[PDB]
Amino acid sequence: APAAVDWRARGAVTAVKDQGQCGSCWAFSAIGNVECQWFLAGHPLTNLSEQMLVSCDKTDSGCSGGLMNNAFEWIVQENNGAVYTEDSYPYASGEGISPPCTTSGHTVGATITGHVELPQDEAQIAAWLAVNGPVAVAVDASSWMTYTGGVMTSCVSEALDHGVLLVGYNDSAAVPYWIIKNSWTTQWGEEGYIRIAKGSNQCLVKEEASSAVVG
Ligand SMILES: *CC(=O)[C@H](C)NC(=O)[C@H](Cc1ccc(O)cc1)NC(=O)OCc1ccccc1
């Protein structure tokens, strides 16, 4: 596997966004992964819509929570593989309320054919990431309100409660780390990003990792 890969330095990752008061982390995780996978399939990097999932994905619960894998399959099975551009369906759940779904007036910005679920093994997750790109992951984010910067070498790891995007790793650093994109604005952590130690299942990072496959 390569020593260090950071997909941000390869034009593959869009800017950090904000879920606001809505419990929509699952939607941000799922869409961020689709955005990166579309770019790596040889298309221009385009911002895609989390609102589409929060308002229209009735197999999840909007501002109450949801699962990245249910979102990926709602796209393929209920929305004919289509993901709308963020520009044509902007975020509207910042106040913690999800408005009724709108089924027209939007534009398709990417399509996916399905999704794969990766092994519960950090080394294996890293080998796939290095070739194929960013992966959606679920974590225990209980301690993340105290994250100020640096490599978090210890993290409360006992219940998965938040979905985020894994965009790289560096195994040649003093402590190998994972690089994670979050959705609590740029004002949190390292410009919206967090680095956690890699190799000890910090914040339960290896437990629920998956990715969309483009088509
Ligand atoms: C991050 C956030 O905004 C909130 C309120 N929580 C969720 O979105 C949870 C994220 C998560 C947690 C564990 C996983 O293994 C994966 C993602 N999800 C959660 O609340 O899942 C609930 C659910 C809703 C509808 C149908 C089935 C399950």
> What SS3 class is residue 84?
strand
* Closest atom, ligand 1, to C-alpha of 23: 3
In a 10 Å sphere around its CB, with 0-12 CB exposed, 13-18 middle and 19+ buried, how is residue 174 labelled? Answer: exposed
Residues in a beta bridge with 214: 112
> What SS3 class is residue 170?
strand
Q: Which of 63, 170, 182, 203 is catalytic?
A: 182
All structural domains of the chain with their residue ranges: 1-215
Say which CATH topology domain 1-215 has: Cathepsin B; Chain A (3.90.70)
Q: According to the entry, how was the structure determined?
A: X-ray
Cα-based angle 71, 207, 127 (whole degrees, multiple of 5): 95
Experimental structure resolution, Å: 2.0
Q: What is each CA distance from 34 to 51, 133, 135, in whole angstroms?
A: 14, 10, 9
Question: Which residue CA neighbors atom 6 of ligand 1 most closely?
Answer: 65
> What is the rounded CA–CA span in Å between residue 7 and residue 32?
12
For 68-181, where are the alpha helices, taking DSSP H only? 68-78, 122-132
Q: Which of 22, 25, 36, 203 is catalytic?
A: 25
**CB within 6 Å of ligand 1 — which residues?**
23-26, 60-61, 65-67, 138, 160-163, 208
Q: Write phi, then psi, for 11 (nearest 5 degrees).
A: 60, 15
Q: Which of 22, 33, 162, 170 is catalytic?
A: 162
Q: Write phi, then psi, for 91 (nearest 5 degrees).
A: -70, 135
Residue 136 burial (CB count, 10 A): 30
Q: What is each CA distance from 6 to 100, 133, 186, in whole angstroms?
A: 37, 9, 18
